[PDB]
């Protein structure tokens, strides 16, 4: 739907339910129609494909929303029951080279 | 706020991507890869 | 898209948009 494209930075939220292998997306507090169903034991890497049209392109935000654990909880087994979002030094950004 | 028991029992994880103003959203894809 | 689309002065952070080479030449000549 119709936005100003610039009132606030676009926030695309990715939600992964690993117990059911269901991938859903949120545009702006609004569930998107696109969804995916992955096969069991799939290992999914968060990914962004971008063609830069600005000095500032985008940013990963490793937070959480209501009733959902943060990404660090599933990434690290030591934080499997830690609701507080974390970005340990092991997690970093890689690019196709 | 949220339900602590549900938050502990859930296997649902979240992350987000903020596309800054001035960057064309048609040139940005967000999701997961293997 | 736009057709279907106390006081808050809040406006748009706009300086981050890019311009092509022809667009930049346009801007230069019209500022001239």
Short mmCIF file of C-alpha atoms in Angstrom, two decimals, chain B residues 20-23, chain C residues 13 16-18:
data_model
loop_
_atom_site.label_atom_id
_atom_site.label_comp_id
_atom_site.label_asym_id
_atom_site.label_seq_id
_atom_site.Cartn_x
_atom_site.Cartn_y
_atom_site.Cartn_z
CA UNK B 20 17.51 3.56 5.24
CA UNK B 21 15.86 6.49 3.46
CA UNK B 22 17.40 7.21 0.09
CA UNK B 23 17.95 3.51 -0.67
CA UNK C 13 15.26 12.87 5.54
CA UNK C 16 20.43 10.18 1.02
CA UNK C 17 18.89 9.80 -2.46
CA UNK C 18 21.24 9.14 -5.38
#
